[PDB]
């Protein structure tokens, strides 16, 4: 949504552009658009959703 | 000076004008073509303009 996908060698995070403050990639701070074969340079990773662990 | 891949830079600018950045990643090829053609017509225009 805002910021950049930044990887530190092994893990991917989202971070605001002007100051390093990495966060876990979750469904809340990212948005979806279409299937994942048209964009160039896309990578693979888990996008955790906080609703699954609660399992209400 | 902080280095950044050029398509991401242009995606930033798209947000700057209120267009969601996914719009750029889905038309990267087309956008690039339009830009190249425009730059090409610039020189001809300067030469043909009296
Ligand atoms: C390249 C790198 O350091 N990645 C870190 C890792 O060191 C750390 O252990 C992990 C959480 O345990 O988060 C990530
Ligand atoms: C770079 C990479 O991870 N590519 C794989 C691709 O080969 C596979 O077909 C797809 C389905 O899971 O997942 C992704």
Complete DSSP assignment for A1-56:
--SEEEE-SS-EEEE-TTS---B--BTTS----S-TTSSTT------B-THHHH--
Instruction: Give A39 to chain B, closest Cα distance, Å.
Output: 6
Answer for the pair A6, A15: CB distance below 8 angstroms, yes or no. yes
Q: In 10 A of CB B25, how many CB atoms?
A: 20
Please say whether the beta carbons of B6 and B12 come within 8 A: no
**Of all protein residues, whose CA lies closest to atom 10 belonging to ligand 1?**
A11
Q: Does A32 touch chain B (CB under 8 A)?
A: no
A7 lines ligand 1 (CB under 6 A): no
Backbone Cα Rg of chain B: 14
The residue contributing the CA closest to ligand 1 atom 5 is A11
- Rounded CA separation A11/B48 (Å): 55
User: Residue B36: enclosing H or E segment and its boundaries?
Assistant: helix B28-48
Resolution to 1 decimal place, in Å? 3.3
How was this structure determined? It was done by cryo-EM
The 8-class DSSP code of residue B18 comes to T
Rounded to an integer, what distance in angstroms lies between the CA atom of residue B38 and that of residue B20? Answer: 23
**What residues are paired with A6 via a beta bridge?**
A13
> What are the tokens at B34?
């339009």
Using a 6 Å cutoff on CB, does residue A11 contact ligand 1? yes
Question: Which residues of B fall within a CB distance of 8 Å from A4?
Answer: 8
């Amino acid at each position: 949504r805002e910021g950049v996908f930044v990887s530190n060698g092994t893990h991917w995070f989202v971070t605001q552009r002007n100051f390093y403050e990495p966060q876990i990639i979750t469904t809340d701070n990212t948005f979806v658009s279409g299937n994942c074969d048209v964009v160039i340079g896309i990578v693979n990773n888990t996008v955790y959703d906080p609703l699954q662990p609660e399992l209400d | 000076a902080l280095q950044i891949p050029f398509p991401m830079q242009m995606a930033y600018r798209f947000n700057g004008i209120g267009v969601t950045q996914n719009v750029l990643y889905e038309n990267q090829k087309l956008i690039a073509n339009q830009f190249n053609s425009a730059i090409g017509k610039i020189q001809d225009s300067l030469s043909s303009t009296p």
